[PDB]
Protein backbone atom coordinates (compact mmCIF):
# COMPACT_ATOMS: atom_id res chain seq x y z
CA UNK A 1 0.00 0.00 0.00
CA UNK A 2 2.30 2.82 1.31
CA UNK A 3 6.11 2.53 0.82
CA UNK A 4 7.26 2.90 -2.79
CA UNK A 5 10.31 2.83 -5.01
CA UNK A 6 9.66 4.02 -8.58
CA UNK A 7 10.58 0.64 -10.08
CA UNK A 8 9.51 -1.57 -7.17
CA UNK A 9 6.80 -0.76 -4.59
CA UNK A 10 7.02 -2.59 -1.22
CA UNK A 11 4.82 -2.45 1.88
CA UNK A 12 1.09 -2.46 2.82
CA UNK A 13 -0.66 -2.78 8.45
CA UNK A 14 2.30 -1.67 10.62
CA UNK A 15 3.11 -1.65 14.39
CA UNK A 16 6.42 0.36 14.30
CA UNK A 17 8.46 2.10 11.59
CA UNK A 18 12.01 3.39 12.05
CA UNK A 19 13.28 6.02 9.59
CA UNK A 20 16.48 8.05 9.03
CA UNK A 21 15.00 11.58 9.01
CA UNK A 22 16.31 15.01 8.09
CA UNK A 23 17.38 15.65 11.67
CA UNK A 24 18.36 12.26 13.15
CA UNK A 25 16.54 8.94 13.33
CA UNK A 26 12.84 8.82 14.29
CA UNK A 27 10.13 6.26 15.04
CA UNK A 28 6.52 6.47 13.93
CA UNK A 29 3.93 4.55 15.98
CA UNK A 30 0.29 3.40 16.34
CA UNK A 31 -0.81 6.98 16.68
CA UNK A 32 1.78 9.56 15.76
CA UNK A 33 1.98 13.25 14.88
CA UNK A 34 1.36 14.11 11.20
CA UNK A 35 4.80 15.05 9.79
CA UNK A 36 6.87 15.45 6.66
CA UNK A 37 10.62 14.93 6.68
CA UNK A 38 13.35 14.59 4.06
CA UNK A 39 14.71 11.08 4.28
CA UNK A 40 18.49 10.99 4.64
CA UNK A 41 20.56 8.22 2.90
CA UNK A 42 20.27 5.44 5.58
CA UNK A 43 18.72 2.23 6.97
CA UNK A 44 15.00 1.74 7.66
CA UNK A 45 12.86 -0.98 9.27
CA UNK A 46 9.34 -2.41 9.40
CA UNK A 47 7.38 -4.06 12.26
CA UNK A 48 4.45 -6.47 12.59
CA UNK A 49 4.35 -7.21 16.35
CA UNK A 50 7.91 -8.49 16.89
CA UNK A 51 9.12 -8.72 13.28
CA UNK A 52 12.59 -7.36 12.39
CA UNK A 53 13.22 -6.46 8.72
CA UNK A 54 15.72 -3.70 7.85
CA UNK A 55 16.33 -2.07 4.43
CA UNK A 56 18.86 0.48 3.23
CA UNK A 57 17.74 3.41 1.05
CA UNK A 58 18.89 6.34 -1.08
CA UNK A 59 16.81 9.03 0.56
CA UNK A 60 13.52 10.76 -0.15
CA UNK A 61 10.49 11.73 1.91
CA UNK A 62 8.41 10.46 4.77
CA UNK A 63 4.90 11.71 5.45
CA UNK A 64 2.82 10.75 8.50
CA UNK A 65 -0.82 11.42 7.64
CA UNK A 66 -3.69 12.83 9.78
CA UNK A 67 -5.70 9.76 8.76
CA UNK A 68 -2.70 7.99 10.42
CA UNK A 69 -1.19 6.31 7.31
CA UNK A 70 2.60 6.67 7.00
CA UNK A 71 3.95 7.12 3.47
CA UNK A 72 7.62 6.52 2.78
CA UNK A 73 9.19 7.14 -0.60
CA UNK A 74 12.75 6.55 -1.75
CA UNK A 75 14.56 5.53 -4.92
CA UNK A 76 16.79 2.41 -4.51
CA UNK A 77 16.85 -0.40 -1.88
CA UNK A 78 16.77 -7.01 2.33
CA UNK A 79 19.62 -5.83 4.61
CA UNK A 80 23.07 -7.47 4.33
CA UNK A 81 21.22 -9.95 2.09
CA UNK A 82 21.69 -7.17 -0.53
CA UNK A 83 24.93 -5.14 -0.22
CA UNK A 84 31.86 -5.69 1.05
CA UNK A 85 34.27 -5.75 -1.91
CA UNK A 86 31.42 -4.48 -4.09
CA UNK A 87 31.43 -1.58 -1.63
CA UNK A 88 35.23 -1.50 -1.12
CA UNK A 89 36.44 -1.26 -4.75
CA UNK A 90 33.78 1.42 -5.35
CA UNK A 91 34.81 3.37 -2.23
CA UNK A 92 38.32 3.52 -3.70
CA UNK A 93 37.14 5.11 -6.97
CA UNK A 94 34.81 7.33 -4.96
CA UNK A 95 37.50 8.98 -2.80
CA UNK A 96 39.68 9.33 -5.92
CA UNK A 97 37.05 11.37 -7.79
CA UNK A 98 36.67 13.86 -4.89
CA UNK A 99 40.09 15.47 -5.52
CA UNK A 100 38.90 16.46 -9.03
CA UNK A 101 30.95 20.54 -10.15
CA UNK A 102 32.20 17.02 -11.08
CA UNK A 103 34.08 16.24 -7.82
CA UNK A 104 31.24 17.82 -5.79
CA UNK A 105 29.14 14.80 -6.81
CA UNK A 106 31.86 12.57 -5.31
CA UNK A 107 31.46 14.40 -1.99
CA UNK A 108 27.94 12.96 -2.04
CA UNK A 109 29.46 9.49 -2.52
CA UNK A 110 31.81 9.62 0.51
CA UNK A 111 28.98 10.23 3.02
CA UNK A 112 26.62 7.73 1.36
CA UNK A 113 29.41 5.17 1.20
CA UNK A 114 30.87 5.71 4.69
CA UNK A 115 27.32 5.15 6.04
CA UNK A 116 26.83 1.79 4.26
CA UNK A 117 30.14 0.47 5.68
CA UNK A 118 28.31 0.46 9.01
CA UNK A 119 25.91 -2.47 8.36
Amino acid sequence: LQFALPHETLYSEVTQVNLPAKSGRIGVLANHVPTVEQLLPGVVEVMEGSNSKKFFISGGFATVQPDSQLCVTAIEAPLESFSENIKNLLAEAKKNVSSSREAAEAAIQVEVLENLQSV
Partner: protein, 52 residues
Protein backbone atom coordinates in the same frame (compact mmCIF):
# COMPACT_ATOMS: atom_id res chain seq x y z
CA UNK B 1 -6.23 10.65 -23.43
CA UNK B 2 -4.41 13.96 -23.61
CA UNK B 3 -4.08 15.00 -19.95
CA UNK B 4 -2.79 17.74 -17.70
CA UNK B 5 -1.54 17.76 -14.11
CA UNK B 6 -0.42 20.57 -11.73
CA UNK B 7 3.02 20.90 -10.16
CA UNK B 8 2.97 23.23 -7.10
CA UNK B 9 6.03 25.20 -5.94
CA UNK B 10 7.67 26.10 -2.60
CA UNK B 11 5.44 29.08 -1.83
CA UNK B 12 2.23 27.19 -2.81
CA UNK B 13 3.25 24.36 -0.52
CA UNK B 14 3.75 26.59 2.58
CA UNK B 15 0.61 28.56 1.79
CA UNK B 16 -1.62 25.47 1.49
CA UNK B 17 -4.67 25.62 3.86
CA UNK B 18 -3.87 22.51 5.95
CA UNK B 19 -0.07 22.75 5.92
CA UNK B 20 -0.54 23.64 9.60
CA UNK B 21 -1.71 20.10 10.43
CA UNK B 22 1.72 18.72 9.49
CA UNK B 23 4.31 19.25 12.23
CA UNK B 24 7.05 19.50 9.58
CA UNK B 25 10.01 21.07 11.42
CA UNK B 26 10.80 24.41 9.73
CA UNK B 27 14.35 23.07 10.21
CA UNK B 28 15.86 24.55 6.96
CA UNK B 29 14.53 24.52 3.35
CA UNK B 30 11.86 21.83 3.78
CA UNK B 31 9.10 22.75 1.34
CA UNK B 32 11.74 23.49 -1.32
CA UNK B 33 12.89 19.86 -1.29
CA UNK B 34 9.33 18.55 -1.41
CA UNK B 35 8.84 20.64 -4.55
CA UNK B 36 12.18 19.71 -6.17
CA UNK B 37 11.23 16.09 -5.72
CA UNK B 38 7.59 16.41 -6.61
CA UNK B 39 8.84 17.87 -9.94
CA UNK B 40 10.96 14.77 -10.67
CA UNK B 41 8.34 12.32 -9.33
CA UNK B 42 5.33 13.88 -11.05
CA UNK B 43 7.34 14.08 -14.26
CA UNK B 44 8.22 10.38 -14.03
CA UNK B 45 4.62 9.21 -13.58
CA UNK B 46 3.60 11.29 -16.61
CA UNK B 47 6.43 9.82 -18.72
CA UNK B 48 5.62 6.25 -17.64
CA UNK B 49 1.99 6.82 -18.54
CA UNK B 50 2.87 8.70 -21.74
CA UNK B 51 5.18 5.98 -23.01
CA UNK B 52 2.75 3.20 -22.12
Amino acid sequence: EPSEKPIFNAKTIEQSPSFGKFEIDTDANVPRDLFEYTLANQMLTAMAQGYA
